[PDB]
């Protein structure tokens, strides 16, 4: 509530030269900001040194602090420290309280230095993913025709492997490959629970595909649409999405889309992978027509960001639902990134509601500002059960 109220009254300064922003960046020993040097007292209930005076901010390696978006985020998120302090005041036994923004930076309390290379990204975390969108029924189509051989085949394999990491045990996924003939990359033949074992099996299967043949989009999309209509087996009964991993084509196949999804009940996400000059027209048309999105993956460095962005599209119905789509959800027992042991995290999305009193913008208000999270240790639950 406080984050929404504060972000509603934002001016969006285009320059931060005269009035810098004051924040404590983590993982540290540029114009636009001034850093904070904390005391970092050694405290119990945590394995490290923490400071209760302010909140630490973590920004990923490939995201540059000092940009206009990041600076505006560090401006409007500075009002969360008071609520962090009040929440601790009402409960001294409270663990990390974190706000992970859609920009990429996470502001967490209490302040503590970050833990080689740092590949941590907040938007890939399971607690962020479960609150960014509802459970899903992903179906991955892979173009394994002659043209994808070489760099744009290992890139597709890595993209699929990274995309599978964005699923949980409440989602259902399957991977299929087509080259004039559609088939499953493994011995599942239907949607699986996408747990650790099924995801590992699918990753091993997709790591062993070879490129040959001629693309036929009609057969592959027919296979995907018939796979998404099984109803013989357990599923999620939620968001149905076909994620297409190809390079380019000269066919859009209006017939298949008209026959299968006439009422547009299934989203279609299309990815263009590799460095090539093939025609991207149909690839973007199929994304636009079916409530989907179009993404380009030209190298390895673009794999991580592009494989996580589709959750912005799936979050539109949640934000347009209103306050009814605001419930606290608890993740599976996982290991804390800040070396705290086994924890579960509560989750609550934050909506962007600037100027909603007059109801006139409605354009960027279809996306979430971020996700709040609070950590509960299993030691507390063990303590409550002598």
């Amino acid at each position: 509530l406080e984050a929404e109220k504060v972000q509603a009254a934002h001016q969006w300064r285009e320059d931060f030269a005269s009035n810098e922003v004051v924040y404590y960046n983590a993982k540290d020993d540029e114009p636009g900001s001034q850093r904070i040097k904390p005391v970092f007292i050694e405290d119990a209930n945590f394995g490290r040194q923490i400071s209760y005076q302010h909140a630490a901010v973590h920004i990923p390696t490939d995201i540059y602090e000092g940009s206009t978006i990041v600076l505006n985020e560090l401006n409007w998120t500075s009002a969360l420290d008071e609520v962090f302090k009040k929440n601790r005041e009402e409960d001294p036994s409270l663990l990390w309280q974190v706000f992970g923004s859609a920009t990429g930076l996470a502001r967490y309390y209490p302040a503590s230095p970050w833990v080689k290379i740092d590949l941590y990204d907040v938007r890939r975390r399971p607690w962020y993913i479960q609150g960014a969108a509802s459970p899903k029924d992903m179906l991955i189509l892979v173009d394994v025709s002659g043209s994808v051989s070489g760099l744009t085949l290992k890139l597709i394999r890595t993209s699929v492997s990274e995309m599978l990491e964005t699923l949980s045990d409440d989602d259902f996924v399957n991977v299929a490959s087509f080259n004039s003939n559609a088939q499953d990359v493994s011995c599942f033949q239907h949607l699986v629970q996408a747990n650790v074992r099924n995801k590992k099996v699918l990753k091993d299967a997709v790591n062993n595909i070879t490129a040959k043949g001629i693309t036929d989009y009609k057969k592959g999309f027919s296979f995907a649409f018939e796979q998404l209509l099984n109803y013989n087996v357990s599923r999620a009964n939620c968001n149905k999405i076909i994620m297409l991993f190809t390079d380019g084509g000269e066919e859009r196949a209006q017939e298949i889309f008209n026959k299968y999804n006439k009422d547009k009940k299934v989203r279609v996400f299309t990815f263009s992978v590799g460095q090539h000059n093939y025609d991207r027209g149909p690839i973007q048309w199929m994304a636009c027509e079916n409530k989907g999105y179009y993404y380009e993956i030209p190298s390895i460095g673009a794999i991580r960001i592009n494989t996580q962005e589709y959750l912005d599209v799936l979050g539109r119905p949640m934000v347009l639902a209103g306050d009814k789509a605001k419930q606290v959800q608890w993740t599976n027992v996982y290991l804390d990134a800040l070396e705290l042991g086994l924890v579960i995290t509560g989750t609550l999305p934050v909506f962007n509601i600037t100027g909603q009193f007059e109801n006139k913008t409605n354009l960027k208000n279809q996306l979430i500002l971020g996700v709040m999270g609070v950590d509960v240790s299993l030691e507390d639950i063990k303590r409550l059960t002598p």
Binding site: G146, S149, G150, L151, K154, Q275
Partner: protein, 195 residues
């Protein structure tokens, strides 16, 4: 001649991150020079006659350059993007310097002989182009589509006709032909087979 020299000096000062005043000055000077050159090609054509003015080959070149410059000017306003650069060709009008020297005859006879055997030059260039096309087609058949390696696909490949003809031209010049040879050998199997 002095006007052409001044035009050359004006066009030779264009550089990256030039002041806006210089850019505007050059933009207006282009119009001024075009109008002046147009008035010197009409008054000299009426004082000599269309048949007598076109007798000299360099006057035909000047007329072609003027027409190209007018086309560039009209085409640089309806869609200002890049530019062909025909306005620079007027610098060739400095070739009048040799006229006042004793080397005018020797340099003029070379151009006379070049124009005399123009058909032979065109035939030789076309034969070279035909051989380049044949070799590009042979390269397309031999290595077309086989340059998709595990790492980045080389730009110097034989997939499309423009790429193959550029590769053949580069090999003709003789620069980095060994790299293309290594890529072809690797495509055909490697050192063991395909050598």
């Amino acid at each position: 001649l002095c006007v052409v020299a001044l035009n050359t000096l004006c066009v030779a000062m264009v550089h990256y991150n030039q002041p806006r005043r210089l850019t505007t000055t050059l933009y207006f000077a282009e119009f001024v020079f075009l109008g002046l050159f147009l008035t010197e090609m009409s008054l000299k054509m009426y004082g000599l006659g269309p048949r007598s003015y076109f007798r000299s080959s360099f006057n035909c070149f000047d007329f072609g350059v003027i027409v190209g410059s007018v086309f560039e000017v009209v085409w640089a306003a309806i869609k200002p993007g890049s530019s062909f650069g025909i306005s620079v060709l007027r610098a060739l009008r400095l070739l009048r310097i040799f006229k006042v020297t004793k080397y005018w005859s020797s340099l003029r006879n070379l151009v006379v002989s070049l124009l005399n055997s123009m058909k032979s030059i065109i035939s030789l260039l076309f034969l070279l182009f035909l051989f380049i096309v044949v070799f590009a087609l042979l390269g397309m058949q031999l290595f077309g589509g086989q340059f998709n390696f595990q790492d980045e696909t080389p730009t110097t490949n034989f997939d499309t006709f423009p790429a193959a003809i550029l590769t053949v031209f580069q090999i003709l010049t003789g620069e980095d032909w060994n790299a293309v040879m290594y890529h072809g050998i690797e495509s055909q199997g490697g050192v063991s087979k395909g050598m």
